[PDB]
Amino acid sequence: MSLFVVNAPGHEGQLKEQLIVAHKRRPLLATAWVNPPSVLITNSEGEVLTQVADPPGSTGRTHQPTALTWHPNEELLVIGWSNGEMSLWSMPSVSSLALGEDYTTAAARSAVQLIAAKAATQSSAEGATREHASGAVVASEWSTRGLYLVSASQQRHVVMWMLEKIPAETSVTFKLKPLWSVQSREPVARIIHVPSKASDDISFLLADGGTSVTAINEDQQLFPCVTQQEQIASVLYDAATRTLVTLTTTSMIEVYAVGEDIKGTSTLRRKLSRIAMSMVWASPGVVAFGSGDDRLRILDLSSGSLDVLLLPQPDLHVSSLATFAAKGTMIVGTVEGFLVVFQHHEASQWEAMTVHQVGKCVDRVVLTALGDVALCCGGSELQVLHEIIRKRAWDGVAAATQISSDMVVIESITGCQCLLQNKGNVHGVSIAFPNIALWNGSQIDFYMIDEATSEITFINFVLTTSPAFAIHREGLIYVKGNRIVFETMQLAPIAQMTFTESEGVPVIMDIMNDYLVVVSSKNYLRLARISTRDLQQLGPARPLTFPLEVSVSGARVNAQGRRVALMSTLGPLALPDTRIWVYDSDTDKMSFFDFGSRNEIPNSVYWNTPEPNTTTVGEFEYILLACETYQENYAEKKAELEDARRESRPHNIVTFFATHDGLVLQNFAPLRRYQICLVGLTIPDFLLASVKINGDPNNAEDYVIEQKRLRDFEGLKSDKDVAVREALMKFSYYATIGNMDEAYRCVKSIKNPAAWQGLARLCVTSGRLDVAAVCLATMEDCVAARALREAKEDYPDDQDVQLATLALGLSMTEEAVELLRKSKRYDLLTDVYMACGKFEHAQRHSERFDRARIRPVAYKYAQFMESLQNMDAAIMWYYNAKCASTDVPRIFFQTNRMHELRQLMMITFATIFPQNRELLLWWAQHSERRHNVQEALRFYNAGEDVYNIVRILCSLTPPKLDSALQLVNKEMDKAKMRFQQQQAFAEPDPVGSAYFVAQLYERQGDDQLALQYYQAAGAYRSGVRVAWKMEQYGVVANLAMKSSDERLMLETAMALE
Amino acid sequence: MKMCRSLPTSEVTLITECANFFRKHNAIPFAIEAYEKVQDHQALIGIYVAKGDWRNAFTILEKTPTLAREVYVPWATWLADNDKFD
Question: What letter would DSSP give residue A611?
Answer: P
Taking one residue from A and the other from B, the number of pairs with CB-CB distance under 8 angstroms is 8
CB A999 within 8 Å of CB A954? yes
Q: Which residue of B has its CA nearest to A984?
A: B59
Residue A352 φ then ψ, to 5°:
-85, 110
Residue A435, beta-bridge partner list: A432
Distance from the Cα of B31 to chain A's closest Cα (Å) equals: 24
Residue A455, beta-bridge partner list: A450
Residue of A450, A413, A445 whose CA lies nearest to A434 = A450
Residue A1037 φ then ψ, to 5°:
-70, 165
Q: Could you give the 3-state DSSP secondary structure of residue B29? A: helix
- Sequence-distant (6+) residues with CB within 8 A of A964 are A949, A950, A953, A954, A993, A996, A997
8 Å CB contact of B59 and A851: no
Q: Which residue of A has its CA nearest to B59?
A: A985
- Sequence-distant (6+) residues with CB within 8 A of A540 are A526
d(CA A430, CA A438): 7
Options 3.40.190.10, 2.130.10.10, 2.60.40.1120, 3.10.105.10; CATH of A2-386: 2.130.10.10
- Give one DSSP letter per residue of A4-70, joined into a string: EEEE----SSEEEEEEEEE-SSSSEEEEEEETTTEEEEEETTS-EEEEE-SPTT--S------EEEE
Residue of A127, A134, A125 whose CA lies nearest to A157 = A134
8 Å CB contact of B58 and A985: yes
Long-range pairs for A1047-1052: beta carbons < 8 A, 24 or more residues apart = A1048/A1020, A1048/A1021, A1048/A1024, A1052/A1024
8 Å CB contact of A851 and B83: yes
Distance from the Cα of B17 to chain A's closest Cα (Å) equals: 30
Q: Does A986 touch chain B (CB under 8 A)?
A: yes
CB B15 within 8 Å of CB B7? yes
**Residue A668 CA: distances (Å) to CA of A241, A357, A591, A657, A672:** 45, 31, 20, 12, 14
Q: Does B85 touch chain A (CB under 8 A)?
A: yes
Q: Does B83 touch chain A (CB under 8 A)?
A: yes
Nearest CB partner across the interface for B62, out of A851, A852, A985: A985
Burial class (CB in 10 A: 0-12, 13-18, 19+), A298: buried
Q: Which residue of B has its CA nearest to A983?
A: B62
CB A891 within 8 Å of CB A878? yes
Give the H or E element holding residue A1050. helix A1046-1056
- Sequence-distant (6+) residues with CB within 8 A of A390 are A1, A2, A3, A401, A402, A403, A603, A604, A676, A677
A chain contacts of residue B58, beta-carbon cutoff 8 Å: 985
Where helices occur in chain B by DSSP H, the ranges are: 2-6, 12-24, 28-38, 41-51, 55-63, 69-81
Residue of A530, A536, A527 whose CA lies nearest to A506 = A527
Rg of the Cα atoms in chain B? 14
8 Å CB contact of B62 and A851: no
Where helices occur in A430-487 by DSSP H, the ranges are: none
Distance from the Cα of A974 to chain B's closest Cα (Å) equals: 21
Q: Does A115 touch chain B (CB under 8 A)?
A: no
**Residue A446 CA: distances (Å) to CA of A344, A475, A798, B68:** 40, 10, 66, 93
Q: Does A984 touch chain B (CB under 8 A)?
A: no
Resolution in A: 3.4
Q: Which residue of A has its CA nearest to B85?
A: A852
Three-state secondary structure string covering A248-288: ECCCEEEEEECCCCCCCCEEEEEECCCCCCEEEEEECCEEE
CB A338 within 8 Å of CB A316? yes
8 Å CB contact of A985 and B85: no
Distance of CA A672 to the CA centre of its chain: 11
Distance from the Cα of B75 to chain A's closest Cα (Å) equals: 17
CA dihedral A973, A974, A977, A983 (to 10 degrees): -110
Residues within 8 A of A (CB atoms), B 56-75 only: 58-59, 62
Residue A393, beta-bridge partner list: A400
d(CA A335, CA A595): 37
8 Å CB contact of A985 and B59: yes
A chain contacts of residue B85, beta-carbon cutoff 8 Å: 852
Distance from the Cα of A986 to chain B's closest Cα (Å) equals: 7
d(CA A225, CA A192): 12
Identity of the residue numbered A923: W
8 Å CB contact of B83 and A985: no
B chain contacts of residue A858, beta-carbon cutoff 8 Å: none
8 Å CB contact of A852 and B59: no
d(CA A801, CA A781): 19
Rg of the Cα atoms in chain A? 45
- Sequence-distant (6+) residues with CB within 8 A of A1039 are A1015, A1020, A1023, A1024, A1027, A1048
Interface test with B, best of A850, A981, A985 (most B CBs within 10 A): A985
Question: What letter would DSSP give residue A450?
Answer: B
**Residue A436 CA: distances (Å) to CA of A410, A476, A901:** 9, 10, 84
- Sequence-distant (6+) residues with CB within 8 A of B56 are B44, B48
- Sequence-distant (6+) residues with CB within 8 A of A637 are A644
Give the H or E element holding residue A205. strand A203-207
Structure determined by = cryo-EM
Q: Which residue of A has its CA nearest to B84?
A: A852
Nearest CB partner across the interface for B85, out of A852, A985, A986: A852
**β A278-283/A266-271 pair status:** unpaired
Q: Could you give the 3-state DSSP secondary structure of residue B85? A: coil
- Sort residue A636 into left (φ over 0), alpha (ψ -120 to 50) or beta: alpha
- Sort residue A869 into left (φ over 0), alpha (ψ -120 to 50) or beta: left
- Give one DSSP letter per residue of A209-238, joined into a string: SSS-EEEEETT----BS---SS-EEEEEEE
B chain contacts of residue A852, beta-carbon cutoff 8 Å: 80, 83, 85
Identity of the residue numbered A910: A
**Residue A595 CA: distances (Å) to CA of A153, A333, A388, A469, A651:** 54, 31, 21, 29, 14
Long-range pairs for A254-260: beta carbons < 8 A, 24 or more residues apart = A254/A226, A254/A228, A255/A301, A256/A226, A258/A194, A258/A225
CB B62 within 8 Å of CB B41? no
Q: Which residue of B has its CA nearest to A985?
A: B59
d(CA A318, CA A362): 9
Three-state secondary structure string covering A412-428: ECCCCEEEEECCCCCCE
Distance from the Cα of B68 to chain A's closest Cα (Å) equals: 15
B chain contacts of residue A985, beta-carbon cutoff 8 Å: 58-59, 62
Nearest CB partner across the interface for B62, out of A851, A852, A986: A986
Q: Could you give the 3-state DSSP secondary structure of residue A805? A: helix
Residue of A131, A129, A133, A21 whose CA lies nearest to A78 = A21
Q: Which residue of B has its CA nearest to A855?
A: B83
A chain contacts of residue B86, beta-carbon cutoff 8 Å: none
CB A563 within 8 Å of CB A583? yes
The end-to-end CA distance of chain B, in Å, is 43
Question: What letter would DSSP give residue A198?
Answer: -
Question: What letter would DSSP give residue B68?
Answer: T
d(CA A1011, CA A999): 10
Angle between helix axes A813-822 and A799-809 (nearest 10 degrees) is 170
> Diameter of chain A by CA atoms?
154
CB A318 within 8 Å of CB A296? yes
- Sequence-distant (6+) residues with CB within 8 A of A632 are A837, A838, A839, A840
CB A234 within 8 Å of CB A190? yes
Give the H or E element holding residue A929. helix A917-929
Distance from the Cα of A851 to chain B's closest Cα (Å) equals: 7
Burial class (CB in 10 A: 0-12, 13-18, 19+), A99: exposed
CB A688 within 8 Å of CB A704? no
Sign, CA torsion A748/A750/A753/A754: negative
**Residue B3 CA: distances (Å) to CA of A629, B7, B15, B32, B36:** 70, 6, 10, 16, 17
**β A172-178/A148-153 pair status:** unpaired
